[PDB]
From TrEMBL, chains A, D, E:
Belongs to the picornaviruses polyprotein family. It comes from Human enterovirus 71. This is Genome polyprotein. The chain holds residues 12 to 69 of 2193 of the full protein. Interacts with protein 3CD. Interacts with capsid protein VP0 and capsid protein VP1 to form heterotrimeric protomers. Five protomers subsequently associate to form pentamers which serve as building blocks for the capsid. Interacts with capsid protein VP4 in the mature capsid. Interacts with protein 2C; this interaction may be important for virion morphogenesis. It is found in: Host cytoplasmic vesicle membrane; Host nucleus; Virion.
TrEMBL record, chain C:
It comes from Human enterovirus 71 (EV71). It is found in: Host cytoplasmic vesicle membrane; Host nucleus; Virion. Interacts with protein 3CD. This is Genome polyprotein. Protein 3A: Localizes the viral replication complex to the surface of membranous vesicles. It inhibits host cell endoplasmic reticulum-to-Golgi apparatus transport and causes the disassembly of the Golgi complex, possibly through GBF1 interaction. This would result in depletion of MHC, trail receptors and IFN receptors at the host cell surface. Belongs to the picornaviruses polyprotein family. The lineage of its organism: Viruses, Riboviria, Orthornavirae, Pisuviricota, Pisoniviricetes. It comes from the Viruses.
Length: 58, 245, 297, 58, 58, 50
């Protein structure tokens, strides 16, 4: 398997290999991906952060 | 300070001390030529430095209405001198070169020349000029001799060759600002290893004045330009008797 | 023994083509950064002029300053050498049932890149070349439909006699293998390697490929070499079942394993024969159209 | 995989293996190649080289 | 790969393995072979051998 | 923090009216005497043309 790829799309957490019926390489299964979500800024735009013990509002 | 030359033969010679420097080629090492791939297997020889020296071949004039000239390489010296007889009776040839063209202009004179060495160039002949009527060019344009031959159209080089796109070859300028003389360096290149000196034509020079010659009336009308060449470390293969066939 | 030293002047160390110059490799290289205006010496490679690379004894930019630009472009896969092939019409031929241009029932065509100068001149921009080639013959009806006929393809290697009849010996072609194809099978797709007698194909070549003295008689061999070529291709219908429909073929061309040299610049004129330096001198026109003035269109 | 090749084209920087659907071997992917360029001699034909500290011209 | 062969043709200098699309085994690539030549007896049928230093003929 | 160095080209050291040149003081000076005609080099400051 002396062959490399010419793709620059990143964002993989596990190494994996691919094999294609065509001469190219990335046309096979893209692999398994997880799910990520972070809606904090969408509903909570607060700059003044208090300590965990203290109440947020006066 | 390696722009020097020690030259003396015949009765006259030309050397320089503070010339317009030199042009280097390919940044390379010295070497002989491939030997273990010829049709035969006989041992080669080495003619060494027996006859290689400079005699000028022509002193080409530059005038008001210069249209262009050139030469045929190595047809210039293939017919004259002991080198001429050696090339005639010997089938394979190879050597390096150091082209030194003498080109001076005075205080009065202004202008420049377009001297381009074009290797591997399939010659653009007259071919009847028009070429639509099958009247083949005579032999008086295939073997002109020591006179060279006159090129027809500058900006197409008799073959459709637009001028601004000649930049591929080593390009030189002739100006009193630039040079009192020009230097050209070319090694031996061929798509095939071995060939005869009468069938195949390697290339030739080309000269077309990039700028028209001008001067206020009362000065010299023409400008002579001198050319000589002497191959360095020449080696000839296909050693045989003085037999053309 | 070892007494005279006349020959010792030699320079053993043969590397490349004949010359006399010398150089030397280096392990590593050099780098440079950018800065602003300052009057100092010793280390100042910040700006680069391709020829001069310094400042003249008359100042160039004493009045104003410059700016900077950042890069975000990649050049890894921008090479064209082999991938430069795109769409374009190529050419076709016909084998009718009844016709005058083909009184024999078979068509033998000389294989070469000289097919149609329109697109070949794009590839003909070079002289010395090593490449792989591909020939595709697709068969259909002259009307544009498909009919289930019986066709096959015979190859003509170079050196074989050119057939002069439908029953010539050239059909046996003992040293030529056989391809199992039929109209039901996908159309022809044949690879052609590089079998040039020389290192590269000869088009821009001034010489005499035939031995003997050169005369006016022996001048036609420019471009059309009877024997130096890589052969032709002959097409006919074999078998007792003769086709009842006329047929047409389209020929598709593609090049692989690019390896080129000897850059040769662009041509703005037309030929009249193969590799003919002759040109329409009476109607020479520049490579581009000019204007009465450059300031305004 | 007891099989060799009959090719003499060199110029590879990494070892690699090939497999072909035909009986030959080199018809598969040729492999990944880098890009190299060296235009020094094209525009700078200078034989007289000075030291890094000294200026090139007098 | 629990399978043997039923062939008795010898003359191999390197071990190698074969795989076939048919049920048989030897129909695949035969492998790479060297070139050997020995024309000594063809032109030199001499029984009386002298030492390396001595001349062959009196 | 300290990441970009665009402004660092400045030349702090303000002394006198705006300019860009630079010089440096020296602790001591130099002297010269007189002599007669002689063909020699190295030390010959005897005469002075302004």
């Amino acid at each position: 398997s002396h062959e490399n790829s010419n793709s620059a799309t990143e964002g993989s957490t596990i190494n994996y290999t691919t094999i294609n019926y065509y001469k190219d390489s990335y046309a096979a299964t893209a692999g398994k991906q997880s799910l990520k979500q972070d809606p904090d800024k969408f509903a909570n735009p607060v700059k003044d952060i208090f300590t965990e013990m203290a109440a947020p509002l006066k | 300070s390696d722009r020097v030359a020690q030259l003396t033969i015949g009765n006259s010679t030309i050397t320089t001390q503070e010339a317009a420097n030199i042009i280097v080629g390919y940044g390379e090492w010295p070497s002989y030529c491939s030997d273990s791939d010829a049709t035969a297997v006989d041992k080669p020889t080495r003619p060494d430095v027996s006859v290689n020296r400079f005699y000028t071949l022509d002193t080409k004039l530059w005038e008001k209405s210069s249209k262009g000239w050139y030469w045929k390489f190595p047809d210039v010296l293939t017919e004259t001198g002991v080198f001429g007889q050696n090339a005639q009776f010997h089938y394979l040839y190879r050597s390096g070169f150091c082209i030194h063209v003498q080109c001076n202009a005075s205080k009065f004179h202004q202008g420049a020349l377009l001297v381009a060495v074009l290797p591997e160039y399939v010659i653009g002949s007259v071919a009847g000029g028009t070429g639509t009527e099958d009247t083949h060019p005579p032999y008086k344009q295939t073997q002109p001799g020591a006179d060279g031959f006159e090129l027809q159209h500058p900006y197409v080089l008799d073959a459709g060759i637009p001028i601004s796109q000649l930049t591929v070859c080593p390009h030189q300028w002739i100006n009193l600002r630039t040079n009192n003389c020009a230097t050209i360096i070319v090694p031996y290149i061929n798509a095939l290893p071995f060939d005869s000196a009468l069938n195949h034509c390697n290339f030739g020079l080309l000269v077309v004045p990039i700028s028209p010659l001008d001067y206020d009336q009362g000065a010299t009308p023409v400008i002579p330009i001198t050319i000589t060449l002497a191959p360095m470390c020449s080696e000839f293969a296909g050693l045989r008797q003085a037999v053309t066939q | 023994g070892d007494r005279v030293a006349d020959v010792i002047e030699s320079s053993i160390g043969d590397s490349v083509s004949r010359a006399l110059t010398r150089a030397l490799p280096a392990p590593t290289g050099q780098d440079t950064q950018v800065s602003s205006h300052r009057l100092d010496t010793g280390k100042v490679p910040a700006l680069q002029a391709a020829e001069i690379g310094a400042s003249s004894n008359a100042s160039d930019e004493s009045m104003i300053e410059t700016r900077c630009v950042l890069n975000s472009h990649s050049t890894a896969e921008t090479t064209l050498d082999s991938f430069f092939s795109r769409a374009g019409l190529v050419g076709e031929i016909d084998l009718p049932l009844e016709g005058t241009t083909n009184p024999n029932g078979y068509a033998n065509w000389d294989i070469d890149i000289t097919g149609y100068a329109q697109m070949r001149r794009k590839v003909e921009l070079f002289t010395y070349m090593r490449f792989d080639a591909e020939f595709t013959f697709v068969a259909c009806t002259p009307t544009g439909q498909v009919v289930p006929q019986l066709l096959q393809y015979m190859f003509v290697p170079p050196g074989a006699p050119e057939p002069d009849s439908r029953e010539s010996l050239a059909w046996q072609t003992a040293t030529n293998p056989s391809v199992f194809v039929k109209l039901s099978d996908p159309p022809a797709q044949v690879s052609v390697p590089f079998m040039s007698p020389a290192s590269a194909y000869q088009w821009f070549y001034d010489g005499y490929p035939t031995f003997g003295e050169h005369k006016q008689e022996k001048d036609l061999e420019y471009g059309a070499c009877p024997n130096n070529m890589m052969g032709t291709f002959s097409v006919r219908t074999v078998g007792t079942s003769k086709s009842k429909y006329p047929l047409v073929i389209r020929i598709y061309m593609r090049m692989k394993h690019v390896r080129a040299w000897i850059p040769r610049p662009m041509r703005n004129q037309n030929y009249l024969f193969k590799a003919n330096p002759n040109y329409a001198g009476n109607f020479i026109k520049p490579t581009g159209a000019s204007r009465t003035a450059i300031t305004t269109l």
